[PDB]
Ligand binder design. Structure first.
Ligand code: HEC
Ligand code: HEM
Ligand code: HEM
Ligand code: FES
Lengths: 132, 122, 39, 364, 383, 72, 244, 85, 416, 50
């Protein structure tokens, strides 16, 4: 089982001040990416309008984002891990480059091989910076 | 493994009905000729899976002459496979010599085994 | 035994044959033959 | 010749420059002791002496090139030896230490004697003819000469019995040394200075020879597997040994293996006149398939009788040849072959094998 | 008795090598076993010489491998052996399973033997996979990741077993270290399983290309089939040299030479070639639990094979239809292996689903149906 | 001049490579036409001559490859 | 995938070191190392090669040592604890132009020029690919393709867009042996040198392979003969079955 | 078991069979290696070809169809059909 | 003593005053070795027909050896001359006797003999060994022919055989016993009248290492025999071959001396009772021989062990035989030779065999002198030449499943 | 006993003690080539210890 030294260090806090108001950054928690990002005003609004029913995946942006603008996404683009490309796909949000599948700004499996919307970690924000 | 009782049951199920007999029997002879065991001197019953108590009993209850002929045919087949050569057409086993010599003994063995099983569950 | 000693005969024979054929097939490419041009 | 023990010595030149020395214990054969003692004694003869063990004496003998055996005969126990002429002083001495001070150790009785005796008995009896001959002797000479020639478990023998039969036998009057191709004077000297000089003149408490008591008109049947055999046995007085040797050779005898004889015309048939000190047995035997033997024995019976006196006289020379062949060093034979007619009506009969097929004496 | 029988150790060596009464009619295929054993030695031998230089730390695994290749005297030779020899180990194992499938070496008297066979197979795959993960290249790391993610599909224990495998929260230093330890180890467990294989072989002996009993004509092994073993061994070593010395990376994947980086997945994930078929099966089934179950069934159904084979005659050498079925199965297995390396695309998803369907249908339908049909045909034809 | 460029020039003029060069050039013309319309930026499928270029380059490589290193 | 995604398959150039019995053209290794230091060292690390690896391959020990002194390396800090530096030596590994991946990405528009010490064994086409990559840049990208800013079109690169941009140009390097420095010549030299760097055992490996093939082929023929000979009694058996 | 040691291999009572053979050192080794390895090998291949060819032809036809369809899909003319799938 | 009569026939006699019985016989060479497959057994049939004639009180018997045949009329000493005339008559009227003969009965007799040699396990094993060793040549044929060939013989065949082989240059009158040689020679000269002719060319024969296995699982033992190309009567190693054979000598497990026999093999095979019995022999034909052993193994699981140990003991022949073993073998061979030459019948057969097949017979004293000249180094040289690493011929009858195929036994011939 | 199969074509043309000598030559050559290969492999592996 995880040995104290590996077991601790799970928090992996990353400061959030550096990211652009709307940008995608990658944090290496749990030996995997946690493609984080702070939502752009237009992007945040576009998502609110988008219908969850329209997507085959049963997920919504409001449930996906704990803190409104600042939300956390796991790095694997597809249900089977696909290295996440940036700003590509059905909505121009991410490309599941491993299969060239399309990942939405939502992070859901918008198009291609992946089964579900990208898994969300514990996006807990303490004031200025957050820990996965 | 399939019992000779069941194999013969199916074979007599087919042979009794003229349509299936006419369709299959030519195909049965064609399949047995293409099988290629006759070219090595083996009769069909030589191919049977010996390593079973029923079959072991069946061989153990063969007559002397049939037992020795079977031994020689098996040895000849082993030698032919060993030297990668086949018997010429004139020396191969003809269709009429493939006489199903061992089937009756196997059927008797299976009859004994089936009666024992049935009576143990009387 | 004589196996140990005899193995040397064949090993050396093949080794010298190959290490004499190789530097003849490839003499134009090896280092020791090209180093003169760049010195 | 003789020595103070009264041990007879006979020596005569030989053709093949081998000193075929042999010792004949006169009445230590299968007739003397209880059934089978002589066989075990013969198996004990050459094993452990008071001078050299088996593994030493046998090795030395083989180095010297000689051969030695101990054969049991109903009259005498014969210790044969055969060696180059240079080798007499050794073997003779050994033979002395064989008759005297043979060890008879129990470990030999259980490891080398009983197993060997049983194996020899089984091998011999596997032959239906020999089993039939043993039965014929049993039913013709009920005791003495009829004792089984080989040890049989039906008559258990313990080591003490064999040891006490070696003693109380082997006496000076009871052994006759015979040699072929050895100077009689040199042999006499070697024997005199060997252990033979220490044997008692006569056995104090044994060797009470019994009368022969020949019985005729009897029959027996011994079921056996494999080959069958029917035998006919005429007991004969010693003075008749000449008549039957001529008869046997007239019809066909085992010693003279030849076709063209009346008995050789039928498969498996043979005849032989076993000769002993005080009696003899003329045996006409047929062997082989039971159905074949059934008719073969009747044909042989009809042949033995109804033999033309002219042909019987013609067979005199063949009988003399047969007697000369039989007279080996161990079994000296002195029979005058006369053409006198020999009757057969007094025959014993024994059948072995498929008793459902073989005929009874009433069918001859 | 001769020293080769009186001494218990030499008695065993004799019973297995010098006097083993092998049948006189065995082809060269029966030599594969020896090769497999030979390969087991080589895998171990070169293996023991790689651990003397391999450092299992995640930050040193790939650099340690490159140190072996570049710095150790014959390290390049030892690594190329240990790798291409594993590839050849699986070539010979697939040939040994193909031979046992063609000739009825899995039938009654040897069912037990067959079972150990399957177990060996399973165990071997683990070892190979685990060893591959030790290189910690891109394909190494991501193969480990994909495997553990798939095993995360067990109904209830799945969420808990994976951390025990990973030794953490993702393929990391503890995972590579435990893989190295278990990979050094499990080959010796496999040696024990091979000893059990040989015992189950010796109890009833080996089969024949003709299928009929060999007891009528059996040959010793020292002058016969040991010198046939030498032909097979030297052919094996000659091809193994053509690979190890010339084009040693042909069987491997180039991406394995890029040090593992969790933050960038390579374009495609494929196991090492010999595991491609099963991987294909894994992708043919959509459900992750369904996929893993179907894969492990694809390996275990060999156990069902001796009972679904209702053939009265051992082996295919004298059977028309069964030979066609066997070769069709073999070529579908190669097709599955091929689809394993190909991207999940429009035609290939359906083709792989059909190929997996037929792969299982072989064992559970075709072998029984064809065997029964041929039994009836044999009896009817002779009459 | 480097041998590689002259080898490409020689090969593309070969009869075998001629049809591929043809197709590639009219593909270029067609794509430029597509770029001429004012609505090009809005088109979902914006054609490109990647495939024709790949065919041409493969058919030219199959010719240059065996000969090039004889030039160096 | 699309043909563009997989990347145009590099052809098979008849490299001097392809056949089973040819070594690297060590002249080409030296020239390729020259081109490397002159061009590639601006961006690419090539860490796993130490100067000692060059002695007897493309440089005499004196030249490698001298090239070592020309660079500075970090030594154990002085006994006073201050950092100290030393001239390079043979045992030292060749230094890359960037201190860490962060610096390399910063200085190349975010693209990370991979370490070249394994680039030949870490790509599909091997040496050929590198060559095809360095001379695969078309003067005019194929019509219709739009590249992300900073990327240059190379058909042999998966995806068709590579951040490198053509580097090898005619007469960019004056070779030490007077060899002409055409772009194709430089590309071949660099590919050969990188192939050596990824396969330093190539020459030794193939020589050992030749010896092993000779030994094993002779031994396999001997085994064939011995087996056929010792099996002649069995393949020559003749049976009879004569019952009554 | 179904295979004992040499003394009793489980073979039925065998009788009347005489096995002749000649020694090595007295037989022509590789007597017909060259001619046999050609003619007999061709004969064996001829006998066993169909069993390997019919399954191979079927499987490789399926594979060729799938491969050609996949190649067609990823082209400027296969874009529409790729989208429809 | 020799006297070449008119017609050129030679009368050879070894007279000894101590002889118990006398014998005289006419031998005309050309045994089975002179026959061919179709007419095999004709020599034995002819000799049986001749020997079936009226004996006039003597004992007329047939010889029927591999390479020579003859009729021997045993008889007591004083009658010898008569027997002489008898055989002379029987041979001067051989063609007439054959013509007037109904071969039926003689052919069933010969068929019975041929079956006998095919039932007695040792006879069958040795006949098969001789056949396989010299396969392809007339010497392979049975001495008494096969049951299949005997029934196919007719009077004209026997007449042709007699005309070809019963000639003065190919016939010898051998005798032994106690009689005046001149009397017998004169008696035979007046009565012997046989056709002239050249000695038939003796057919060639060459040893061929081979194995023959008549496995009959119904028998109770395994009767095997293994031998190498021995020494013919001409070779000066003849007695050396006999000494080499006697080095290993005989053995019978149940015999009393079984635990004490000198040969090392006897001590080796008694540890687990590997073998029931064996006997080493050096069969010598006119120009080729078979030197080896015959063996009967009771335990069917120990045939391989016996073969292994026996061939290892043969390997000892070329390396480690001690002066003790050589001296024992010399003494035993001398004694065996003297035993074989005791009976007048045996002496006559030996005289005929030697005079016909080698032309000259070494007296027993000369043979003893020749044997006593053997040293251990001579025996080891012979072992190197003829036993060490030479092809072997094998034969077996029953329960020979454990008799490993040729290569094992053959390779045992050279392992140290 | 009986007529053996004719091996004339199978028989070797070479001398009785010569063919076995040649067999010895090639078996020993195989043994010593194998010894040389084993020496090379073992030396290569043990050189890693250095
Ligand atoms: C300046 C900056 C240079 C120079 C002088 C060279 N390269 Fe190359 N390199 C460079 C970049 C920005 C990249 C990014 C690659 C990408 O965008 O994916 C690379 C990459 C490579 C590669 C990778 C090829 C691949 O992954 O398919 C190789 C191989 C490579 N570089 C080799 C190389 C060689 C041989 C050079 C000779 C002078 C060379 N580079 C020069 C940036 C730069
Ligand atoms: C049947 C048994 C085995 C098989 C099939 C096998 C197979 C493999 C394979 C395929 C690899 C991948 C290596 C690469 O791709 O570079 C590997 C790696 C490795 N194996 Fe084995 N192996 C076996 C037993 C062993 C044993 C007994 C050891 C003992 C040390 C061992 C040690 C290693 C090591 C250290 C590596 C790391 C690879 C490297 O550093 O290059 N293996 N194994
Ligand atoms: C290291 C791996 C293995 C070794 C060393 C080994 C050993 C052997 C040996 C020595 C033989 C006898 C020669 C032969 O029949 O080819 C044999 C036969 C066999 N092999 Fe294996 N084995 C291994 C793996 C396997 C596997 C994985 C399977 C099946 C999944 C298998 C199935 C068999 C069977 C069934 C036989 C009996 C063949 C017959 O009697 O016809 N083996 N094995
Ligand atoms: S890319 Fe997301 S499933 Fe493979």
């Amino acid at each position: 089982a995880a040995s104290a030294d590996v077991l601790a260090m799970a928090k992996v806090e990353v400061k959030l001040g550096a990211i652009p108001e709307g940008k995608n950054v990658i944090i290496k928690w749990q030996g995997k990416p946690v493609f984080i990002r702070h939502r752009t005003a237009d992007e945040i609004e576009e998502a609110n309008q988008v219908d969850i029913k329209t997507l085959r995946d049963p997920q919504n942006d409001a449930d996906r984002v704990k803190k409104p603008e600042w939300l956390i996404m796991l790095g694997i683009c597809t249900h089977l891990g696909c290295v996440p490309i940036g700003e590509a796909g059905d909505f121009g949000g991410w490309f599941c480059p491993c299969h060239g599948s399309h990942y939405d700004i939502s992070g859901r499996i918008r198009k291609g091989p992946a089964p579900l919307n990208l898994e969300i970690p514990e996006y807990d924000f303490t004031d200025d910076e957050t820990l996965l | 493994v399939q019992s000779m009782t069941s194999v013969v049951k199916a074979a007599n199920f087919i042979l009794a009905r003229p349509t299936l007999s006419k369709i299959i029997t030519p195909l049965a002879q064609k399949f047995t000729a293409y099988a290629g065991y006759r070219e090595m001197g083996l009769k069909f019953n030589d191919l049977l899976l010996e390593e079973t108590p029923i079959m072991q009993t069946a061989i153990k209850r063969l007559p002397s002459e049939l037992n020795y002929s079977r031994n020689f045919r098996i040895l000849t087949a082993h030698q032919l496979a060993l030297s990668h050569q086949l018997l010429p057409a004139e020396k191969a086993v003809k269709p009429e010599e493939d006489d199903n010599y061992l089937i009756p003994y196997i059927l008797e063995a299976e009859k004994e085994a089936f009666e024992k099983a049935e009576l143990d569950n009387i | 035994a004589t196996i140990f000693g005899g193995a040397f005969a064949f090993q050396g024979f093949f080794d010298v044959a190959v290490n004499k054929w190789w530097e003849e097939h490839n003499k134009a490419k090896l280092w020791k033959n090209v180093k003169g041009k760049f010195l | 010749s003789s020595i103070p023990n009264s041990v007879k010595i006979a020596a005569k030149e030989s053709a093949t420059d081998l000193t075929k020395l042999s010792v004949i214990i006169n009445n230590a054969g299968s007739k003397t002791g209880k059934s089978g003692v002589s066989h075990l004694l013969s198996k004990f003869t050459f094993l452990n002496n008071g001078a050299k063990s088996a593994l030493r004496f046998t090795r030395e003998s083989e180095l010297l090139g000689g051969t030695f055996e101990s054969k049991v005969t109903r009259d005498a126990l014969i210790l044969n030896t055969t060696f180059l002429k240079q080798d007499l002083p050794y073997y003779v001495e050994a033979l002395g230490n064989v008759v005297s001070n043979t060890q008879f150790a129990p470990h030999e009785f259980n490891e080398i004697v009983l197993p060997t005796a049983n194996a020899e008995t089984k091998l011999a009896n596997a032959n239906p003819a020999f089993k039939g001959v043993e039965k014929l002797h049993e039913i013709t000479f009920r005791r003495g000469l009829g004792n089984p020639l080989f040890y049989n478990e039906s008559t258990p023998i313990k080591l003490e019995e064999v040891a006490q039969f070696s003693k109380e036998q082997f006496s000076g009057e009871n052994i006759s040394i015979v040699a072929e191709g050895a100077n009689e004077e040199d042999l006499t000297k070697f024997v005199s200075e060997s252990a033979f000089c220490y044997l008692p003149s006569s056995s104090s408490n044994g060797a009470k020879a019994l009368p022969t008591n020949t019985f005729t008109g009897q029959e027996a049947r011994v079921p056996s597997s494999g080959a069958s055999s029917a035998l006919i046995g005429i007991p004969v007085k010693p003075a008749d040994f000449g008549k039957y040797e001529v008869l046997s050779a007239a019809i066909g005898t085992s010693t003279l293996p030849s076709t063209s004889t009346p008995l050789a015309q039928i498969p498996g048939a043979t005849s032989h006149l076993y000769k002993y000190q005080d009696a003899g047995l003329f045996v006409i035997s047929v062997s082989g398939e039971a159905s074949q033997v059934a008719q073969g024995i009747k044909q042989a019976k009809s042949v033995a009788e109804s033999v033309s006196s002219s042909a019987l006289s013609e067979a005199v020379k063949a009988a003399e040849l047969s007697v000369a062949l039989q007279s080996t060093v161990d079994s000296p034979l002195n029979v005058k072959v006369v053409a006198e007619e020999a009757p057969i009506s007094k025959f014993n009969y024994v059948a072995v094998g498929d008793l459902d097929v073989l005929p009874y004496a009433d069918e001859l | 008795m001769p020293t080769r029988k009186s001494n218990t150790y030499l008695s065993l060596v004799n019973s297995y090598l010098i006097d083993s009464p092998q049948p006189s009619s065995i082809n060269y295929w029966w030599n594969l076993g020896s090769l497999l054993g030979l390969c087991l030695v080589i895998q171990i031998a070169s293996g023991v010489f790689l651990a003397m230089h391999y450092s299992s730390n995640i930050e040193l695994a790939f650099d340690s491998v490159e140190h072996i290749m570049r710095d150790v005297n014959a390290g390049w030779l030892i690594r190329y052996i240990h790798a291409n020899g594993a590839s050849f180990f699986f070539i010979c194992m697939y040939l040994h399973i193909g031979k046992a499938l063609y000739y009825g070496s899995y039938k009654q008297p040897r069912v037990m033997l067959w079972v150990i066979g399957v177990v060996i197979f399973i165990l071997t795959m683990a070892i190979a996979f685990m060893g591959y993960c030790l290189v910690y290249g891109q394909m190494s790391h991501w193969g480990a990741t994909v495997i553990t993610n798939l095993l995360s599909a067990i109904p209830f224990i799945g969420n808990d077993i994976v951390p025990f495998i990973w030794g953490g929260f993702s393929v990391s230093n503890p995972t590579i270290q435990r893989f190295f330890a278990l990979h050094f180890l499990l080959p010796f467990i496999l040696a024990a399983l091979v000893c059990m294989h040989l015992m189950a072989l010796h109890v009833h002996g080996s089969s024949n290309p003709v299928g009929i009993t060999g007891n009528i004509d059996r040959l010793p092994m020292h002058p016969y089939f040991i010198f046939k073993d030498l032909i097979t061994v030297f052919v094996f070593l000659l091809i193994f040299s053509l690979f190890v010395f010339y084009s040693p990376n042909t069987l491997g994947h180039p991406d394995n030479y890029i040090p593992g980086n969790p933050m960038v997945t390579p374009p495609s994930i494929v196991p090492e070639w010999y595991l491609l078929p099963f991987y294909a099966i894994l992708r043919s089934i959509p459900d992750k639990l369904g996929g893993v179950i179907a894969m492990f069934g694809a390996i275990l159904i060999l156990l069902s094979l001796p009972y679904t084979d209702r053939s009265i005659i051992r082996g295919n050498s004298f059977k028309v239809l069964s030979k066609l079925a066997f070769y069709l199965f073999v070529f579908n297995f190669i097709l599955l292996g091929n689809l394993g390396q190909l991207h999940v695309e429009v035609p290939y998803i359906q083709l792989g689903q059909f190929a997996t369907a037929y792969y299982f249908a072989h064992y559970i339908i075709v072998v029984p149906v064809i065997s029964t049909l041929e039994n009836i045909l044999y009896y009817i034809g002779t009459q | 001049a480097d041998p590689l460029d002259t080898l490409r020039e020689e090969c593309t003029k070969t009869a075998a490579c001629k049809p591929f060069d043809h197709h590639f050039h009219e593909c270029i013309e067609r794509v430029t036409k597509e770029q001429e319309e004012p609505d090009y930026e809005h088109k979902h499928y914006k054609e490109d001559c990647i495939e024709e270029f790949f065919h041409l380059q493969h058919c030219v490589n199959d010719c240059v490859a065996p000969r090039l290193f004889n030039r160096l | 995938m699309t043909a563009a995604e997989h990347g145009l398959h590099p052809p098979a150039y008849n490299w001097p070191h392809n056949g089973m019995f040819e070594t690297f053209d060590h002249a080409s290794i030296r020239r390729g190392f020259q081109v490397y230091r002159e061009v590639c060292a601006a961006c690419h690390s090539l860490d796993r090669i130490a100067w000692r690896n060059l002695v007897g391959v493309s440089h005499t020990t004196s030249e490698a040592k001298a090239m070592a002194e020309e660079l500075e390396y970090d030594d154990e800090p002085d006994d006073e604890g201050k950092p100290r530096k030393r001239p390079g030596k043979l045992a030292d590994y060749i230094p890359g132009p960037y201190e860490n991946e962060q610096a390399a990405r910063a200085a190349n528009q975010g693209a990370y020029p991979p370490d070249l010490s394994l680039i030949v064994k870490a790509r599909h086409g091997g040496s050929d690919y590198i060559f095809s990559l360095l001379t695969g840049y078309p003067d005019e990208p194929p019509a219709g393709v739009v590249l992300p800013e900073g990327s240059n079109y190379n058909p042999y690169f998966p995806g068709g867009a590579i951040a490198m941009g053509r580097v090898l140009f005619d007469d960019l390097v004056e070779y030490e042996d007077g060899t002409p420095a055409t772009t194709s010549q430089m590309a071949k030299d660099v590919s050969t040198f990188l192939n050596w760097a990824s396969e330093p055992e190539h020459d030794d490996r193939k020589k050992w392979g030749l010896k092993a093939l000779v030994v094993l082929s002779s031994l396999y023929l001997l085994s064939i003969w011995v087996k056929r000979f010792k099996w002649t009694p069995i393949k020559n058996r003749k049976f009879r079955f004569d019952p009554p | 078991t179904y295979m004992g040691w040499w003394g009793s291999l489980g073979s039925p009572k065998q009788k009347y069979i005489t096995q002749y053979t000649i020694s090595p050192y007295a037989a022509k080794p590789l007597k017909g290696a060259a001619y046999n390895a050609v003619f007999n090998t061709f004969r064996r291949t001829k006998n066993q070809f169909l069993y390997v060819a019919i399954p191979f032809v079927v499987v490789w036809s399926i594979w060729t169809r799938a491969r050609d369809y996949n190649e067609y899909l990823y082209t400027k003319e296969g874009r529409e059909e790729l989208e429809r799938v | 003593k020799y006297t070449t009569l008119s017609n050129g026939v030679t009368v050879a006699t070894e007279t000894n005053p101590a002889a118990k019985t006398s014998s005289v016989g006419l031998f005309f060479g050309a045994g089975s070795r002179s026959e061919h497959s179709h007419s095999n057994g004709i020599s034995a049939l002819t000799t049986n027909v001749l020997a079936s004639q009226s004996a006039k009180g003597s004992l007329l018997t047939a010889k029927n050896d591999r390479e020579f045949n003859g009729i021997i009329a045993q008889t007591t000493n004083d009658n010898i001359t008569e027997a002489g005339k008898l055989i002379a008559s029987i041979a001067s009227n051989a063609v007439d006797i054959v013509e007037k003969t109904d071969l039926t009965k003689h052919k069933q007799y010969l068929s019975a003999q041929a079956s006998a040699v095919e039932a007695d396990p040792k006879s069958k094993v040795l006949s098969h060994l001789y056949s396989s060793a010299f396969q392809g040549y007339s010497l392979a044929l049975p001495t008494l022919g096969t049951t299949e060939s005997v029934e196919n013989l007719e009077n004209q065949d026997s007449l042709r055989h007699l005309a070809k082989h019963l000639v003065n240059n190919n016939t010898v009158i051998a005798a032994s016993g106690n009689f005046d040689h001149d009397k017998l020679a004169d008696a035979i000269e007046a009565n012997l009248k046989i056709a002239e002719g050249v000695k038939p060319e003796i057919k060639p024969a060459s040893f061929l290492g081979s194995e023959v296995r008549m496995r009959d699982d119904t028998l109770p033992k395994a009767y095997i025999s293994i031998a190498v190309h021995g020494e013919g009567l001409n070779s000066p190693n003849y007695y050396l071959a006999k000494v080499a054979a006697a080095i290993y000598g005989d053995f019978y497990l149940h015999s009393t001396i079984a635990k004490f026999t000198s040969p090392k093999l006897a001590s080796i095979v008694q540890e687990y009772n590997i073998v029931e019995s064996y006997n080493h022999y050096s069969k010598s034909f006119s120009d080729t021989g078979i030197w080896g052993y015959y063996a009967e193994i009771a335990d069917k699981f120990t045939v391989d062990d016996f073969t292994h140990f026996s061939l290892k003991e043969w390997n000892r022949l070329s390396i480690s035989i001690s002066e003790a073993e050589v001296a024992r073998a010399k003494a035993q061979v001398k004694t065996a030779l003297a035993k074989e030459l005791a009976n007048s019948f045996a002496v006559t057969s030996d005289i005929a065999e030697k005079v016909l097949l080698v032309g000259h017979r070494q007296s027993l004293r000369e043979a003893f002198e020749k044997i006593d000249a053997i040293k251990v180094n001579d025996v080891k040289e012979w072992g190197k030449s003829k036993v060490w690493d030479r092809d072997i011929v094998i034969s077996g009858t029953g329960l020979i499943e454990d008799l490993l195929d040729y290569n094992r036994n053959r390779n045992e011939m050279a392992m140290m």
